[PDB]
């Protein structure tokens, strides 16, 4: 009895595993795209650091950035093949991020799944974890204020700043330039956060395959 039984318990963990592997692989694929998108915005933000840019050049950068922001929003709202949202924790049936502000509305608890007697492997990192978090490596705000954690806020503030024509207004220029500097720090912090998650999903995939190929 205990044999058949155990062999059936390990037969079941085998299924969880197969479910876990497809879920983690899609997340990893989508996060790979999130990385490239943020790196693209980072390049525009660096260009925006140039003090002699035309207001029309600045507005152009804002438009490029709105586009990247919109790609990232679509990635943050990604679903799997059954239309369940992958960055929403357990709340898989409503979009985790609102279009207007990029606020997170999904679940807070990470999705877990029993993989082997021993472990309880975290599957499905939540939206908060990817798009609204920073690691301990985060570059702090020079002025001691709290670091922005929400990627969409980082992008949205920069966009609003760049769309503000600042010709002939040094005060507005310094303000907008400070917003761009803040976004620059934030995007490094966001990139580091996404890189951290991707590495951890890589580990998860490695584990799953080590029990799957086992």
UniProtKB/Swiss-Prot annotation:
**GO biological-process terms attached to the record:** bacterial-type flagellum-dependent cell motility
* Chief location bin: secreted
Which cellular compartments is it found in?
A: Secreted; Bacterial flagellum
What does the entry list under GO cellular component? Answer: bacterial-type flagellum hook; extracellular region
Keywords attached to this Swiss-Prot or TrEMBL record, sorted alphabetically, are: Bacterial flagellum, Secreted
- Keyword Manganese annotated: no
Q: Which GO terms describe its molecular function?
A: structural molecule activity
Of which family is this protein a member?
A: Belongs to the bacterial flagellin family.
Q: What is this protein called?
A: Flagellar hook-associated protein 3
């Amino acid at each position: 009895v205990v044999l058949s039984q155990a062999q059936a318990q390990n037969s079941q963990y085998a299924l969880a595993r197969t479910f876990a592997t497809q879920k983690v692989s899609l997340e990893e694929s989508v996060l790979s795209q999130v990385t490239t998108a943020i790196q693209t915005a980072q390049e525009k933000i660096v260009y925006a650091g140039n003090g002699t840019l035309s207001d029309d050049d600045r507005a152009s950068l804002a438009t490029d950035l709105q586009g990247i922001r919109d790609q990232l929003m679509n990635l943050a709202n990604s679903t799997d093949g059954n239309g369940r949202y992958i960055f929403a924790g357990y709340k898989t049936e409503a979009a985790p991020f609102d279009q207007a502000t990029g606020g997170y509305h999904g679940g807070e608890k990470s999705v877990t799944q029993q993989v082997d007697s021993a472990r309880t492997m975290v599957i499905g990192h939540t939206g908060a974890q990817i798009f609204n978090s920073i690691t301990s490596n985060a570059v702090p705000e020079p002025d001691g204020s709290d670091s922005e954690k929400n990627l969409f806020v980082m992008l949205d503030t920069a966009i609003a700043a760049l769309k503000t024509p600042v010709e002939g207004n040094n005060v507005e220029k310094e303000k907008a330039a400070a917003a761009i500097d803040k976004t620059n720090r934030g995007l490094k912090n966001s990139l580091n956060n996404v890189l951290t998650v991707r590495a951890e999903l890589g580990t998860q995939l490695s584990e799953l395959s080590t029990l799957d190929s086992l």
